[PDB]
Amino acid sequence: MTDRYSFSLTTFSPSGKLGQIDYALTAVKQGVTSLGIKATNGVVIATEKKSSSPLAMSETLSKVSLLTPDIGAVYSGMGPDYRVLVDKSRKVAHTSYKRIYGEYPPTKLLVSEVAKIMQEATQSGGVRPFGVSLLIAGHDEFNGFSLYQVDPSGSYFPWKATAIGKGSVAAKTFLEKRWNDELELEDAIHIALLTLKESVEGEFNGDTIELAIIGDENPDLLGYTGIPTDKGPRFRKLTSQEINDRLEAL
Amino acid sequence: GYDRALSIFSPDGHIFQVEYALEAVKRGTCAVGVKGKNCVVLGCERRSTLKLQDTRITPSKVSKIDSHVVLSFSGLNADSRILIEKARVEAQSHRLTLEDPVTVEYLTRYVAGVQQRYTQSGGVRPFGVSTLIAGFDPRDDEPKLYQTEPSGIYSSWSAQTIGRNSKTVREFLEKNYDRKEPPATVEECVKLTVRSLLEVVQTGAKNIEITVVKPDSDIVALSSEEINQYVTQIEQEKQE
Amino acid sequence: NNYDGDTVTFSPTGRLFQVEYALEAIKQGSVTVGLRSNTHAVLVALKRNADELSSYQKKIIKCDEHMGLSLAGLAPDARVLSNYLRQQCNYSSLVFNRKLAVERAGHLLCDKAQKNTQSYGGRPYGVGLLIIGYDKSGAHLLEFQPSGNVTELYGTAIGARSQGAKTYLERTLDTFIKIDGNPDELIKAGVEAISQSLRDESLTVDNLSIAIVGKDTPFTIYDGEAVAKYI
Amino acid sequence: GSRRYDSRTTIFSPEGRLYQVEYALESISHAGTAIGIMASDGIVLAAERKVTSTLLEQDTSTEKLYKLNDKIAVAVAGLTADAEILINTARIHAQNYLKTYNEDIPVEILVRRLSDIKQGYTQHGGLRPFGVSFIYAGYDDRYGYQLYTSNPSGNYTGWKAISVGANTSAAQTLLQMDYKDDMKVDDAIELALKTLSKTTDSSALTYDRLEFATIRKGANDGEVYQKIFKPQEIKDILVKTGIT
Amino acid sequence: MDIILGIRVQDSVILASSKAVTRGISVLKDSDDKTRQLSPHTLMSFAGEAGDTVQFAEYIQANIQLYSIREDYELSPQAVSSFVRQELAKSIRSRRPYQVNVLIGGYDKKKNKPELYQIDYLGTKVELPYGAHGYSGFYTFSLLDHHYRPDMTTEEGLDLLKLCVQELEKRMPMDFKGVIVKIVDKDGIRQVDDF
Amino acid sequence: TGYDLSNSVFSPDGRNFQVEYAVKAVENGTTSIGIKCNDGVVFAVEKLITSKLLVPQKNVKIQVVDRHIGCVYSGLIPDGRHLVNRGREEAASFKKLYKTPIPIPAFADRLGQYVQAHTLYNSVRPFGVSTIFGGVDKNGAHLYMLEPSGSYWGYKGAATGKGRQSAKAELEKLVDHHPEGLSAREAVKQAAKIIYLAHEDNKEKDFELEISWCSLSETNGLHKFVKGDLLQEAIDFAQKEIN
Amino acid sequence: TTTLAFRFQGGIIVAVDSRATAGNWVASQTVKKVIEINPFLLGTMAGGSADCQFWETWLGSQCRLHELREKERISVAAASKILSNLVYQYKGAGLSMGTMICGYTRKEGPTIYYVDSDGTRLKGDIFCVGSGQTFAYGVLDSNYKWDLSVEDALYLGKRSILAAAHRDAYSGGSVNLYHVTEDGWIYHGNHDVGELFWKVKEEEGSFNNVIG
Amino acid sequence: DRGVSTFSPEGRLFQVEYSLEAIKLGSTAIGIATKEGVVLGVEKRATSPLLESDSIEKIVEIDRHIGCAMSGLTADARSMIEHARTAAVTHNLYYDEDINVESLTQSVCDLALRFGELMSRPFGVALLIAGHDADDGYQLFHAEPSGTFYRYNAKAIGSGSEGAQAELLNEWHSSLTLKEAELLVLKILKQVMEEKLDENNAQLSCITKQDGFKIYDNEKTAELIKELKEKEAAE
Numbered sequence A: 001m002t003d004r005y006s007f008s009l010t011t012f013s014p015s016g017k018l019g020q021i022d023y024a025l026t027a028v029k030q031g032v033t034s035l036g037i038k039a040t041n042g043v044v045i046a047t048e049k050k051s052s053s054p055l056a057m058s059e060t061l062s063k064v065s066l067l068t069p070d071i072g073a074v075y076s077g078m079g080p081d082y083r084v085l086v087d088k089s090r091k092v093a094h095t096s097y098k099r100i101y102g103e104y105p106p107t108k109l110l111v112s113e114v115a116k117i118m119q120e121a122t123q124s125g126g127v128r129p130f131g132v133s134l135l136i137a138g139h140d141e142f143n144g145f146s147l148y149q150v151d152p153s154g155s156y157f158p159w160k161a162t163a164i165g166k167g168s169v170a171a172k173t174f175l176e177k178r179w180n181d182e183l184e185l186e187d188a189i190h191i192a193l194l195t196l197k198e199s200v201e202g203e204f205n206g207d208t209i210e211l212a213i214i215g216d217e218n219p220d221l222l223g224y225t226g227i228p229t230d231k232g233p234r235f236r237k238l239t240s241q242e243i244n245d246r247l248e249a250l
Numbered sequence B: 001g002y003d004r005a006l007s008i009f010s011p012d013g014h015i016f017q018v019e020y021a022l023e024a025v026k027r028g029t030c031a032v033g034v035k036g037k038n039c040v041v042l043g044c045e046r047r048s049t050l051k052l053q054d055t056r057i058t059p060s061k062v063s064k065i066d067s068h069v070v071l072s073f074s075g076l077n078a079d080s081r082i083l084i085e086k087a088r089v090e091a092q093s094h095r096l097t098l099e100d101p102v103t104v105e106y107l108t109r110y111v112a113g114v115q116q117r118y119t120q121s122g123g124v125r126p127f128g129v130s131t132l133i134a135g136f137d138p139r140d141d142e143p144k145l146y147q148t149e150p151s152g153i154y155s156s157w158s159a160q161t162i163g164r165n166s167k168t169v170r171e172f173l174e175k176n177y178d179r180k181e182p183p184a185t186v187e188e189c190v191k192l193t194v195r196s197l198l199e200v201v202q203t204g205a206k207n208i209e210i211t212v213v214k215p216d217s218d219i220v221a222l223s224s225e226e227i228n229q230y231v232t233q234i235e236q237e238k239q240e
Numbered sequence C: 001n002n003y004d005g006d007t008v009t010f011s012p013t014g015r016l017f018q019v020e021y022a023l024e025a026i027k028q029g030s031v032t033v034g035l036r037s038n039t040h041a042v043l044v045a046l047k048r049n050a051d052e053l054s055s056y057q058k059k060i061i062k063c064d065e066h067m068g069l070s071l072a073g074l075a076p077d078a079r080v081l082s083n084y085l086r087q088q089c090n091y092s093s094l095v096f097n098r099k100l101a102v103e104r105a106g107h108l109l110c111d112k113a114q115k116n117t118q119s120y121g122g123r124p125y126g127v128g129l130l131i132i133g134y135d136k137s138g139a140h141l142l143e144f145q146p147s148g149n150v151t152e153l154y155g156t157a158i159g160a161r162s163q164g165a166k167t168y169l170e171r172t173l174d175t176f177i178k179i180d181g182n183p184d185e186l187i188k189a190g191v192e193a194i195s196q197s198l199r200d201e202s203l204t205v206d207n208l209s210i211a212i213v214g215k216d217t218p219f220t221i222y223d224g225e226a227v228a229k230y231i
Numbered sequence D: 001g002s003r004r005y006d007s008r009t010t011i012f013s014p015e016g017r018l019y020q021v022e023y024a025l026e027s028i029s030h031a032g033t034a035i036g037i038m039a040s041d042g043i044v045l046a047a048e049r050k051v052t053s054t055l056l057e058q059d060t061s062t063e064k065l066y067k068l069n070d071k072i073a074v075a076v077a078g079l080t081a082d083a084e085i086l087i088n089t090a091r092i093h094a095q096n097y098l099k100t101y102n103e104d105i106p107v108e109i110l111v112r113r114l115s116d117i118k119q120g121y122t123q124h125g126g127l128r129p130f131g132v133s134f135i136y137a138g139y140d141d142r143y144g145y146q147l148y149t150s151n152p153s154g155n156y157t158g159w160k161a162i163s164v165g166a167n168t169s170a171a172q173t174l175l176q177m178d179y180k181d182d183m184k185v186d187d188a189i190e191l192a193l194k195t196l197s198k199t200t201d202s203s204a205l206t207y208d209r210l211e212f213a214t215i216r217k218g219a220n221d222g223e224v225y226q227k228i229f230k231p232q233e234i235k236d237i238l239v240k241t242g243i244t
Numbered sequence E: 001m002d003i004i005l006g007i008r009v010q011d012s013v014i015l016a017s018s019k020a021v022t023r024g025i026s027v028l029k030d031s032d033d034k035t036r037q038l039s040p041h042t043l044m045s046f047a048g049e050a051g052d053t054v055q056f057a058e059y060i061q062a063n064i065q066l067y068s069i070r071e072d073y074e075l076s077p078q079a080v081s082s083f084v085r086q087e088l089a090k091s092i093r094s095r096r097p098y099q100v101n102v103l104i105g106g107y108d109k110k111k112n113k114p115e116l117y118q119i120d121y122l123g124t125k126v127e128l129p130y131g132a133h134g135y136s137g138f139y140t141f142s143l144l145d146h147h148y149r150p151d152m153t154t155e156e157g158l159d160l161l162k163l164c165v166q167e168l169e170k171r172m173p174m175d176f177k178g179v180i181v182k183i184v185d186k187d188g189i190r191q192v193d194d195f
Numbered sequence F: 001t002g003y004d005l006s007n008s009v010f011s012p013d014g015r016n017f018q019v020e021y022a023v024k025a026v027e028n029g030t031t032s033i034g035i036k037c038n039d040g041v042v043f044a045v046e047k048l049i050t051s052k053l054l055v056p057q058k059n060v061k062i063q064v065v066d067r068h069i070g071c072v073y074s075g076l077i078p079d080g081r082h083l084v085n086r087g088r089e090e091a092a093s094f095k096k097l098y099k100t101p102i103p104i105p106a107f108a109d110r111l112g113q114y115v116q117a118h119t120l121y122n123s124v125r126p127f128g129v130s131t132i133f134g135g136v137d138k139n140g141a142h143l144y145m146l147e148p149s150g151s152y153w154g155y156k157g158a159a160t161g162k163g164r165q166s167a168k169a170e171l172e173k174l175v176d177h178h179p180e181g182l183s184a185r186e187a188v189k190q191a192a193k194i195i196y197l198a199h200e201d202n203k204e205k206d207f208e209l210e211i212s213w214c215s216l217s218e219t220n221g222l223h224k225f226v227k228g229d230l231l232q233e234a235i236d237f238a239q240k241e242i243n
Numbered sequence G: 001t002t003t004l005a006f007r008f009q010g011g012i013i014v015a016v017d018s019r020a021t022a023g024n025w026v027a028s029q030t031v032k033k034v035i036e037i038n039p040f041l042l043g044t045m046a047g048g049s050a051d052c053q054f055w056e057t058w059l060g061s062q063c064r065l066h067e068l069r070e071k072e073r074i075s076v077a078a079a080s081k082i083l084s085n086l087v088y089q090y091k092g093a094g095l096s097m098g099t100m101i102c103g104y105t106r107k108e109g110p111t112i113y114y115v116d117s118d119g120t121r122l123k124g125d126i127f128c129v130g131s132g133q134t135f136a137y138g139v140l141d142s143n144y145k146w147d148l149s150v151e152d153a154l155y156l157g158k159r160s161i162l163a164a165a166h167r168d169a170y171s172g173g174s175v176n177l178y179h180v181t182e183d184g185w186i187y188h189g190n191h192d193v194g195e196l197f198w199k200v201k202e203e204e205g206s207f208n209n210v211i212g
Numbered sequence H: 001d002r003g004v005s006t007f008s009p010e011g012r013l014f015q016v017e018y019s020l021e022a023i024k025l026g027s028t029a030i031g032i033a034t035k036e037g038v039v040l041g042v043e044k045r046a047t048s049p050l051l052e053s054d055s056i057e058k059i060v061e062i063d064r065h066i067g068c069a070m071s072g073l074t075a076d077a078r079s080m081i082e083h084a085r086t087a088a089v090t091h092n093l094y095y096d097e098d099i100n101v102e103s104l105t106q107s108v109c110d111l112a113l114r115f116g117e118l119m120s121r122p123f124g125v126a127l128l129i130a131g132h133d134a135d136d137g138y139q140l141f142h143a144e145p146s147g148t149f150y151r152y153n154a155k156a157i158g159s160g161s162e163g164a165q166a167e168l169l170n171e172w173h174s175s176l177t178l179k180e181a182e183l184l185v186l187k188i189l190k191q192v193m194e195e196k197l198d199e200n201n202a203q204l205s206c207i208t209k210q211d212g213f214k215i216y217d218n219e220k221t222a223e224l225i226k227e228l229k230e231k232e233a234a235e
């Protein structure tokens, strides 16, 4: 018994390709489109809620996940792989940072830790790479707002705006035309909804679209009052109703 | 832990991984060892497809294991560092428990044992390295030159060469080295070593390294000009 | 064919080929015979040499004062298994002050051999054993196969041409079973049994190996001039 | 068992080559070119970013050039994720040396240890090697300014000027042509950029597709300063040499 | 063990170390050298628990010599002292700590300066113009406070050291059988045979 | 293909061929049966007499677990013994912690999970035995049959080995003709008959009958071997029915 | 115990007593406190009898393994250091050993090493070890010269043990003498203190404290 | 590939059988056992004339009463010898006596099969273990990588083994003297060796109860070679 697979399942081919990473990226290509746009006073991450069955309750399945109060994540590719990454990402933020410095990690460093986890699945014994690309949006005091993309290889790149998955090629071209360095958060949400409508085929409403923002602090969502320095989470998931309001003035 | 038996017997009774490690040695730059009446000289080829090198800081081909023993090699450069490090640690460990520096035979025997262990241990491949180990035992003026190889066998040599085109320079040494009368002086020994490398090398410029080891921890590396004088002298006598 | 790379693989007809190949090593091994009465149990083993300059490979091993076996196949594997038996017999003595039952000895060998046939990396034992002993329920004879299968018998034989001795004992069953209180006659029956497996060679003084255990006889081996009596 | 699926990453070819190391070098040959040039009064590190997108955040980005300590930096060519594993090790190794000896680590010692780690992955463990080549640029008070390179085999060598990644054959010929020993930093800056500009697979070399760094003694008196160039500073140095 | 002294002067470091090895009511040896050469320009004297002292000294010696061979370079006295301190700092929280106090006298060839470090078994390091371990300090520190000058020669340092040994031979309860004196300077380590 | 070369590999059907191959080893083995009765269970097995040299009554194949459970199996005999050894460890640890002897359904899952575990990895081989077992606990009598895959169910009657179909047919008749129930002493006699009837599928070598039983009234809830007069009575009953 | 060994012009003299004690109970009078490691090495025993006996015969096995592996007799320095490094590993555990590794080799000449259980290892010309070491020192030091003859040195070693055997309550039995030369060790007999005392008293005129 | 501890269809371990082929490539080693002693002789076989032949160590001391000669991948023998020496000395430590030659051989052979997936492969070297003890007198053992050992009156291993063994079959009798055995090893070595036999490329040794295990000098062997040539010419 015991894990006898102590050797790499991802190896270099004669041409220099890492097969499993390439194939994992193929799995990401098949995945549903998600995107991220960085504004001057916030970031927006969005994706389509592909329902497996109309009897299924798509509210119970959350594609956009809070990692820290000021960092959110969305993905394209294999949902189960994403779910466990979010679990590990949430924990590493605590173990390797908050329990040491008494504050939440800045976006770039949390991203770095997630990348490390995905890189190890590329080299460690008896494991395949993760079949997802992440888009991590976040804010921190000294870097401000930021948006990162993390690939199955463990590589990560900062973006002004981007899209991953099914119709990423067309979506990226759409974003290049619309993005400027003076976009306000509400303008970015508007563009996000426009870009996403291109890739979505069926219903397009607040129940089939999942969308969150990294913006201003939300004291109402903090849960307590009395500490002035604690001002609430910058991450906020837009409600089904809040999305439909913006779809009328679309 | 990774357990795989990588070095294994084949139907004809060969351990291919050990034999393929010898091919890596054959690819490596030539190294030669010649021992005289009162000295040993280690000569080493350095390939000249690398210009813009920084020779101050580039790892030298001949390494000191202790103040009285040296080690040159042919084959994989990265592999050789692991053997050298282990040998250097064992050298200090021997001084610590025996209160006497290692003999050249003992040090060689240790390095050869390490190489052997990597031929029947799970999860590891053999060292793609053959070494020439030279020096003088403590309080002894008799020169010592030993050779090791990936399989783990080791032996003493009056003169020997390893690496690429070593069979050519071994041919040279076999007729030019007299057992009854080894190079009586340092000059004679260095010249015979340089001559033997000039059969294979190309130019006698920054392609040849020479290190001379004498008794009682007397080791010095020759500079370009010093070596170049031997190259100049040999070529003028050749035109005859 | 494709299902003989290791012991952990079943064939499409439900066979373990590595176990069967281990069984094959026994068939190449030199013949050895086992038989018992109600009072004594006897091993008779034909030893094998490399050539005329070599010694004759010892086939019989003692396990305790009341137990021992003979081997056919890989001798080092017999050494491992005999050593394991020696320890189990000894554990029973030190802890319980109890001589290990020959039946339990068989159960223990079965379970040890079995584990090697169900796990990756390992291999089956390449030897067959004939265990004789005398315990609280009289004389015994066991046949161990490296598949794990242990079998209690009145008499048997394993090795090359063992079918000759095994047929003979099957005929002689009613005779030799009632050789009670007579060691030399029970051995004679065993020496005659092993003779049915001989071809071109005959039993010489440094070729024959005999062991005996019984009611008032500790497990003792006879070699050299001590077996000249029976040729 | 699992033997069936083992690639055997740490074995020799019949020719005496390490398959995986050779294939990792092939991987690295497609990565963006990185150049190191050592002058008498400093070192230049120049690297080309892999085909950039216009929406990529350029200023808050790090792909090629990384800082190991205050005296040593590295240029990367290969898998970035692999490189970061090794960089964090190298960063820790430097701090261990400082903690032990109360002296900044000599460049070669740091390089050797990082190269020794790579070597290990080619001889034991059954894991794939790191698909990374480094250019180490650093200073210490023994040898002064030093350039090294290491590759997946775990072999390292010292250089006056060197390139890794894509088009090294062409890049090395151009460096070998125009390099001389009495060269200054500002000349080396110009050489590095001119070389990339000629070897690049892109149409034209621009500020947004470059990472640049210098290690000078251009601080105040007998001390070393690392300068990781900002986007605007690369834009200026590119105009100053007349490439754009 | 017992008496180990150190004096850093203008151009050298001078280490004095008692020759007596006592056990119970018997002086077993009166010519013991309580010092090891770590490198050509670095000397370490030691005092403390029996066995531990030499075992520790030779272990440090091996490590420094290993470093010298690996890098083909001599570690600075500062670097060696920091390495030694860390080894003792580990040791003190071990299952059985090294009970060894040391003085490290060295000549830094890069700075062209003598350097004297005092390190106790806890891993407490200090650079000093003059140092002592054990009860010796109680006499020599105040003596050196008075007579020491930073610009003294090696000869003046030896006379200053004779003054310490005389004071110890007068007021110390135990017979420590004199001292072995060694000088560390630009030309390396040498022993004064007539003291 | 190659899906059948490694254990724990799903074929495109969704099958583990290595387990199905282990079943072939079970089908090759001698016949064994189990009969559930009024207040207990009865086990019986066919022992092929390979040679005259086999000592009668001295190659016992039915095994006891704890003091109240009986186990019999067909296929690779050593594999069966390994499984019983585990069963005994499982039963010991249950009694150690919980005091009460292990219930039969509880025990059945302990073997079930262990056998199933040997279908999860390629580094182990599936068990080459189907095991019929059972006994009496606080809730009465239980009979079970466990297969190489780890699959097991409760049974009124169970049969495995080379003569399983012959035995199954005979078992189905007993279930139909006795809806109220079969007595323990009756089930012993029937077990003998069914082994003799199932021997027709293995009739080259003649055989030796071995029976055991647990019964709340007859054996006081404990596992015992059927020997002597009761065994010979059952053998005679079986001999009368084949003729 | 009282054991000594001293170096001189004609090699090394080694002398030991033969008493073993368990408190004030005299456990034995005929114990061998010298172990002959090889034809050129000797070991002396003082302290715990089992500790000395077990580890010094173990030392002999290590020295044999050295000459098998290195095709050369082990040095006195290396042999002593094997033993000292061993006992240092057991430091604190409670071993009790006072030993002297005496022998000749070509590279070293006659050499003596003091090794004890708290890890002390010392090269020297004269050592006395044991409960009666001080008594042996008193006689040995006051009569020692480098230029002693082999005959005189043998007697002084014998007389020094006798001195301690007399005064020290935990020393006695008999004297075992050894002489180590360039050709190896030579045994110079067992000398019972029962007879040796009176023989020395009479002939030497010493021991005037005792009733004659 | 395939398991290291895999059986062939004929009932043999592949790796053990392949290691036997490696031993056939090795240099010839011959041992002869008499009532006056056991003689061990080996072919040195220097690969080049520059190699100093006296550094070729294929005959080895295990204890004073046990010697050993090797053939095959001789680098593999180092850890076997190391084990044998430790086993021999350890037994002397535990029991204050010499260890039996058979017990020593058995201890060495226990390492043999300690390979698989322990070491990664069998040993590629065969050993001739010669010695003397009080119980069974002068003994010669052939230790293989199979874990099996046979006692022999005489035995040859290596490349010239089957030819030499057939020669030893004819020549050996139970009344050979030591001197007769010495010459016999030299005679048979000279027959199967490629290069011409002399004191530099062949080495003799013996173990006797009185003097223990001794490797002969090149001067002593040279005289036995000269004595051998004269005796063959003398009829």
Ligand SMILES: *[C@@](C)(CO)[C@](*)(O)[C@H](Cc1ccccc1)NC(=O)[C@H](Cc1ccc(OC)cc1)NC(=O)[C@H](C)NC(=O)CN1CCOCC1
Pocket (backbone or CB within 6 Å): G001, G002, G019, G020, G021, G022, G023, G027, G031, G032, G033, G045, G046, G047, G048, G049, G050, G052, G053, G094, G095, G096, G130, G131, G170, G171
């Ligand atoms: C003189 C006689 C003073 O004791 C010597 O030191 C002598 C040396 C010696 C060497 C080899 C063989 C015999 C004698 N030592 C003894 O005779 C020794 C004295 C001693 C007792 C106890 C000790 O405790 C650490 C240390 C020294 N006597 C013994 O060892 C006696 C025979 N045995 C015991 O006391 C048994 N003890 C030993 C310690 O562990 C508990 C059991």
